[PDB]
Amino acid sequence: TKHIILVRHRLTKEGCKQADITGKKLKDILNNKKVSVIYHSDMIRAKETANIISKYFPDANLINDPNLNEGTPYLPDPLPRHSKFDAQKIKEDNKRINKAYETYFYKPSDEDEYQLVICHGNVIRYFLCRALQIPLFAWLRFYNCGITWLVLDGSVVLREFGSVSHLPFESVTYF
Amino acid sequence: NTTKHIILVRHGTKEGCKQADITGKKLKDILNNKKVSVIYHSDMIRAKETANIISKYFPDANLINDPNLNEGTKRINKAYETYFYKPSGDEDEYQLVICHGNVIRYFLCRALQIPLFAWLRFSSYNCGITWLVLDDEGSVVLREFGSVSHLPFESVTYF
Amino acid sequence: NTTKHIILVRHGTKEGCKQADITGKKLKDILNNKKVSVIYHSDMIRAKETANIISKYFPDANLINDPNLNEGTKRINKAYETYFYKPSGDEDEYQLVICHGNVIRYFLCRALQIPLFAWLRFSSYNCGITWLVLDDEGSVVLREFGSVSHLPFESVTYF
Amino acid sequence: TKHIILVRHRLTKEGCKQADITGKKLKDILNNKKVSVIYHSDMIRAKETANIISKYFPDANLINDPNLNEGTPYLPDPLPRHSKFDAQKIKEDNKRINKAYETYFYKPSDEDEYQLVICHGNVIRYFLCRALQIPLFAWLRFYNCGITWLVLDGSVVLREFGSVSHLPFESVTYF
C-alpha cells in the first residue's frame, strides 16, 4: 500500500463554496482516520483553500511547500535574451516539481495516517500524467474532479470525486 | 514512402520481469509479421535485462549495447544523432531502443521539435512505449496504439 | 452482498450482424464463467435479431420478448419497474436487456436518479453496453469495462 | 464516405485571433476543394466566428441554424414551478439538438463539396459523444481542438487540429 490524496483549488472568489464542499466530503470519506498534514503552495488561493479545509480537520498541521508552486506560464518568444532566461527558469521549475512528485508519491508511507496535498491544476496534471502514465493522446485533447485518491502498488485503485453539469459523482477505477 | 520506426522502450524485480515480458508480447502483437532489425540498449543493468526479456519475441534482432544511451538529468546528442537520421533506400525498418525516461523525453522533444514553451508540459510524459516514425523526407510523427497504452480496465460510478 | 447486473445492450444489416456477434463475444470474455439467466428484448425485429446472435454465447439463457421495451421518444414505466427491482436471496444474477437507445437513456437516468438539470448532458449518451448493478439494499452503480468501450486503436500526431 | 467538419468558436474578444488562425488552417487543409456553406447559431460570437472564417472562403454561403443554439444552462432548483417550466424547455432543447445532429451527421452527402459547421462547445460535445459513442468515463472527467473532421463509414477516421500549451498539433485517429 501507499495512498495519496490530491485536492484541487488572486483570492478565492466563491471557490470557497467549492473548497468548503470539498472539505465536507473529505471529512466524510476520511471519517475514523487521522489527517496529520495538509500541504499547499505559496499561492494565496492555495493557502485559502487549505484554511477552509482546516476547519474539517482541526488537529491537522498546514505545511507550506514552495515546490507545489504552479510557477510561470511561458509563451512563444522571438527574443533569444528571453530564451536563455526562460530555459534556465524551466530547469529549476523542473527540479522543483520533480522534487514534489517524489515527496508526495515516493516518500515512504503509517497506513491510518493521511496527508492532503492541495494542488494547482497544472500540478495535479503533472502528478497524474506521470503517476498513471497517461498517454499523450489524452492530454493533447484535454479535469472535473476535486479529490483524487490513489492506492498502489503497478497496481492502482483510483478514487475520484467531482461533479459534471452540477451533479456530484464518485468513481472507483481499477488499473 | 520508406519509413524508420524508432520504438523507445522505458525500463523504469520479479514483477519488473513480468512487465518487460508483457511489453515484449504487446509489441509483437502489433509488429506481427514485421522484422525488428535491432534492439539497442544502454549499459544499465535494467536496460540489458529488459532488452533480453523482450528479445525473446524478436530472436533474429541484433542486440546492440550503446553506453551513450546511459541516462543523466550532452554526449546524449551523440546517441540521438545516431538513431534519428533519415532512412534511405526502399525497405522499411523497425528498431527498439531500450532506455531511461529522461533520454526518452529528450528524444521525444528533439525529434518532434517541441519548443521551450511546451517543455514543462511534456516533462510529465512517462509512457512505456514511445513509437516515433521517421520518413525519407526527414519528417517525424508520433504514433500511439491503444493496446500498449496504460488504461484502466474497469470503473464503478455512483451518483 | 447479493447483486443483480442489468446489462442494457443497444441494437442501434450484414455488418450489423457482425457487430452484434462481436458484442456477444465481448460480453462473454467479461462474464466468463457466469450464467446469464435471461436475455430480454423488445418486439422490434433488430432487437430479436441481436438477441438471437448474442444468445449463441449464452445457450442456457432464457430468451424473453417484452413488447413493453418497444421504443418511443409512459408504458415504459411498466418495463423499468419490471427489471429494476432489488434482488433478494443469496445468488447473484446477470441479465441482458436488448433495446433502443431512448429506452436505455431513460433507464440510465431513472436507475441512477439523474436530476433534470443533468438530463441534457446525459442525452448524448450512446454506448453499446450499459452495465448497471443493483444490490439487495436498493442501491444502483454503473460499471464500465474498457474492453467493451468504443475507443480508437491508433493515432498519429504531427507537431 | 460521409465527411463532417466541426469548428469551435457577448462578442468575440481576441477569439478573433483564434477564429482567424482557424480560418487560415481550414483554407490550408481544404485547398482544392469547394466549401459551399458555413453553418452557425443565432449567437453573436457564432456569427462573428463565421464572419471571420468567411474571409477564407468568399464563395461560401453563411447559413443560420437556430438548432445549433447552445441554449440555456439549468441549475439545481427547489421550486417545482421552475421544474415543470424547465422539464418542458428541456424537451424542446432535445428535439432541436437532435434535429441538428441528424442534419449534419445523417443528411445524405457530393464528395468534393464540404460544409463547415460552427459549434458551441456544448454542441460539439453532444455531437461527438453521440457520434463516437464516447464512454461516460471520459465525459464525466473532461476539448483542446478547434477543428474536428470526421470520415465514416462504424468505421471512422478522425482528424483533429488544436493546440496544447500554445503548441499547434494535428492528429489522425483510427477507430
* Cell numbers given for B17: 520481469
The residue written with cell numbers 462504424 in the block is: D154
Residue B125 has a CB neighbour count (10 Å cut-off) of 19
Residue B13: C-alpha distances to residues A130, B18, B63 (Å): 21, 9, 22
Nearest CA in chain B to D167: B118
User: Does residue A138 fall inside a structural domain?
Assistant: yes
The residue written with cell numbers 466468463 in the block is: C32
What distance in Å separates the CA atoms of residue C35 and residue B84, rounded to the nearest whole number? 54
* Cell numbers given for A150: 490513489
Amino acid at D24: K
CB B98 within 8 A of CB B42: yes
A119 touches chain B (CB under 8 A): no
User: Does residue A123 fall inside a structural domain?
Assistant: yes
**Subunits with 3+ C-beta pairs closer than 8 A to D:** A, B, C
Nearest CA distance, C158 vs chain D (angstrom) = 5
- Return the axis-axis angle of helices B14-31 and B45-55, rounded to nearest 10°: 50
User: Does residue B157 fall inside a structural domain?
Assistant: no
What distance in Å separates the CA atoms of residue C102 and residue C106, rounded to the nearest whole number? 6
Nearest CA distance, C109 vs chain A (angstrom) = 12
User: Does residue D171 fall inside a structural domain?
Assistant: no
- Residues 6 or more apart in contact with residue A17 via CB below 8 angstroms: none
User: Does residue D173 fall inside a structural domain?
Assistant: no
**Subunits with 3+ C-beta pairs closer than 8 A to A:** B, C, D
CB contact under 8 A, A144 and D141: yes
Nearest CA distance, B106 vs chain A (angstrom) = 13
Nearest CA distance, C44 vs chain B (angstrom) = 31
Please state whether beta strands B154-158 and A167-174 pair in parallel, antiparallel, or not at all (unpaired). antiparallel
Chain C interface, best mutation among A136, A141, A167, A170, by max C CB count within 10 A? A167
Q: Closest Cα partner for C20 from C39, C43, C35, C6?
A: C39
CB D130 within 8 A of CB D101: yes
- DSSP label at C148? G
What distance in Å separates the CA atoms of residue D162 and residue D170, rounded to the nearest whole number? 7
Please state whether beta strands B62-65 and C93-99 pair in parallel, antiparallel, or not at all (unpaired). unpaired
Cβ-based contacts under 8 A for chains A and D: 35
Helix, strand, coil percent content, chain A, rounded in steps of 5: 40, 30, 30
Amino acid at B69: L
User: Does residue C69 fall inside a structural domain?
Assistant: yes
DSSP per-residue letters across D89-151: HHHHHHHHHHHHHHHHHTS----SEEEEEEE-HHHHHHHHHHHTT--HHHHHH---EEEEEEE
- Residues 6 or more apart in contact with residue D138 via CB below 8 angstroms: none
- DSSP label at C131? E
CB A148 within 8 A of CB A159: yes
- Residues 6 or more apart in contact with residue A121 via CB below 8 angstroms: A8, A9, A143
Please state whether beta strands A2-8 and A113-119 pair in parallel, antiparallel, or not at all (unpaired). parallel
* Reported structure resolution in angstroms: 2.4
Number of domains in chain D: 1
B159 touches chain C (CB under 8 A): yes
Judge residue C145's burial from the number of C-beta atoms within 10 Å of its C-beta, 0-12 exposed, 13-18 middle, 19 or more buried.
Answer: middle
C127 touches chain B (CB under 8 A): no
Nearest CA distance, D139 vs chain B (angstrom) = 13
A133 touches chain B (CB under 8 A): yes
Please write down the HEC assignment for all residues of B13-34.
CHHHHHHHHHHHHHHHHHHCCC
Nearest CA in chain D to A142: D143
Q: Using CB atoms, pick whichever of B144, B150, B155 lies closest to residue A133.
A: B150
What distance in Å separates the CA atoms of residue A166 and residue A168, rounded to the nearest whole number? 6
Nearest CA in chain A to C141: A171
Report the Cα–Cα distance between both ends of chain B, in Å, rounded. 52
Q: Closest Cα partner for A135 from D64, D171, C90?
A: D171
Beta bridge partners of B130: B8
Please state whether beta strands D167-174 and D157-164 pair in parallel, antiparallel, or not at all (unpaired). antiparallel
Q: Closest Cα partner for A149 from A2, A1, A6?
A: A6
CATH number, position B128 = 3.40.50.1240
- Residues 6 or more apart in contact with residue A59 via CB below 8 angstroms: A34, A35, A36
Residue A32 has a CB neighbour count (10 Å cut-off) of 5
Q: Using CB atoms, pick whichever of A137, A164, A166 lies closest to residue C155.
A: A137
User: Does residue B158 fall inside a structural domain?
Assistant: no
Beta bridge partners of D148: D6, D160
Say how many CA atoms lie within 13 Å of A160 toward its Cβ.
22
CB B131 within 8 A of CB B34: no
Q: Using CB atoms, pick whichever of B121, B155, B157 lies closest to residue D164.
A: B121
Q: Closest Cα partner for A86 from A96, A99, A75, A100?
A: A75
Report CA Rg, chain B: 16
Nearest CA in chain C to D157: C152
* Cell numbers given for D38: 458555413
Q: Where does chain A have alpha helices with state H?
A: 15-30, 44-54, 80-105, 121-131, 136-141
Residue C71: C-alpha distances to residues C42, C43, C105 (Å): 8, 10, 11
* Cell numbers given for A136: 499523450
User: Does residue C158 fall inside a structural domain?
Assistant: no
Range of the domain at A33: 1-164
